[PDB]
Amino acid sequence: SLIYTITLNPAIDRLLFIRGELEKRKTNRVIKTEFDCGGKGLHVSGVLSKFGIKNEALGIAGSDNLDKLYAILKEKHINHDFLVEAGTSTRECFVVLSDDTNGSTMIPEAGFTVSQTNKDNLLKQIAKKVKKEDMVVIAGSPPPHYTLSDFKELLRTVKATGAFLGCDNSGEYLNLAVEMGVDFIKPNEDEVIAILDEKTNSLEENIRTLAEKIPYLVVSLGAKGSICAHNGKLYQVIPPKVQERNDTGAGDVFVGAFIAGLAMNMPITETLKVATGCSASAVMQQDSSSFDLEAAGKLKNQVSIIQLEE
Amino acid sequence: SLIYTITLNPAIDRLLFIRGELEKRKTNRVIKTEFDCGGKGLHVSGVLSKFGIKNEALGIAGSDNLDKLYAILKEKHINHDFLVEAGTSTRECFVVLSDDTNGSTMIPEAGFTVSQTNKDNLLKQIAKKVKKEDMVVIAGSPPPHYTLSDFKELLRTVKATGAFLGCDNSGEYLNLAVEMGVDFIKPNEDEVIAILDEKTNSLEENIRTLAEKIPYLVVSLGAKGSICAHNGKLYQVIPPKVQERNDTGAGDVFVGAFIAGLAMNMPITETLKVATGCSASAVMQQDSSSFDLEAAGKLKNQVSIIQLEE
Ligand SMILES: [K+]
Ligand SMILES: [K+]
């Protein structure tokens, strides 16, 4: 079986290293420039490849900087079968950070216009490639003019294959994934509340209710960890405390590692420890997408899981 | 006669338009991307061309994004005879601004390594092209590894032609231009004080002393205007008050317009009014390099000039 990621709006992440804080309305000299691939689906693929789990990245990239994107992907051991949009470039996201500080400032370009030809080609690729035994992870917002109905077509095309379908999305796109019955989502608490438009039940009751439509539900609670609902059970996941450097993109690492755990047929509790361990390792790294596999192994074994009753 | 500009470290300015303030440690979505040419010498050439004054831009650009740079230059009506560094790209400066706010945040890449071959080629171009009746304006810092001695060779090569030589530079590079006797510099007050390492005389006395080595000396006083020393006279230049949008690059506009005034054989006082008028117009524009020629004409005629006695 295989794992496919779908990155509707990939990016070349340009990391701009400066001295000290970013000062607005001032000149902030770049000490060094580094390049990474962006778009959540690509981060997920990078994580899976780090686990040695076979996967293929799908999405739509621009022809004009395609050589640059492919060289980065090769560097990150990401196998892909991207569709190419002629006469455009994959967007850049500018990531302003410092060796001297914590966190990063994200300045992303929006993305290009995907042709109906390529929208259709994506749907066809899914039909031709994806089997019932595979997993498909759609991660990241669509580019401008890739509409809600486009996204509906996409979800249903995956669903018709019988494959496991995970969605790491936000806003209206996340609302759709719930309505249409995907297998996995990773909303935060406010997203759970917004999806249900429910203001007076406990968060735990909201999660148990949302679990009636989502078989693998992980709710992020920021620093406090996660609550996962699976098979009528509810798990509180508490991460180890770590020296935090930058939590940007740690959510994508969690997704990659969680899917990895599932693909390795790990029990849900072990999968949650693996995902949380990798995510905690990522928070310790200054960049957006990376994590330390050996440190993640140790942090996995410092995660506590409590089953919540009733 | 001709005017040559020298941009040792040109840039493609990428203007990143966002909503509201730039928030560090947060995502700042780009609404639109615009492109401009950067490097002070190129700004100067753009201004001269806007005046209809024939000029040629010299410098060293990277081969890898040369088509992009040339298309921008064509768009800005900048004639050029750039040297090309193989296997590299002209640096980008990222300029974060908003329609909703004032000012801009500059995030410049440092520039590439110029080969000795191209350093030598620049010196040769100067020898072959530049005549006693021409003007040469060196504006902007050299790229990494273009040294103080490299810059000395550059200044002396220009001086040997007999041409008028203006330098818009900072730090050690500005110190050199004073020692070696250029015709024009535009230091700020602190730079004047640093050049002379003189802490106890009046600023006016510092300027009159520096004027013994610089025939066209303009000292910027920020919002208060300028003091210019020429031919044993001292002029206080007071700009009109304007609705300010972004003063970034207004100094380059002043230089272009000041040189323009000189090339049009305008009396010094008229030249100062023109330069200040154009600079005030530039402060009213949101971007880095532009100004309104018609508004600048009006603002020129609102500038007051007082001759300071003794
Ligand atoms: K990180
Ligand atoms: K401006």
Number of strands of chain A: 14
Q: In percent, how much strand structure appears in the residues of chain A? A: 15-25%
Our Rg estimate of chain A from Cα atoms comes to: 19 Å
Number of helices of chain A: 10
Distance between the termini of chain A: 36 Å
CATH class wording of chain A: Alpha Beta
Q: What count of structural domains of chain A? A: 1
Q: What is the general shape of chain A? A: globular
In quaternary terms, these chains amount to homodimer
**Within the largest sheet of chain A, what's the order of strands?**
5-4-1-8-9-10-11-12-13-14
The CATH superfamily of chain A is: Ribokinase
**What name does the CATH topology of chain A carry?**
UDP-N-acetylmuramoyl-L-alanine:D-glutamate ligase
CATH architecture of chain A: 3-Layer(aba) Sandwich
Would you kindly provide a brief summary of this structure?
The first copy, chain A, is an alpha/beta fold and 310 residues long.
Short key terms for the protein model shown above:
homodimer; 310 residues; alpha/beta; UDP-N-acetylmuramoyl-L-alanine:D-glutamate ligase; ten-stranded mixed sheet; four-stranded mixed sheet; 14 strands; 36% helix; globular; binds potassium ion; nucleotide-binding (chains A, B); transferase (chains A, B)
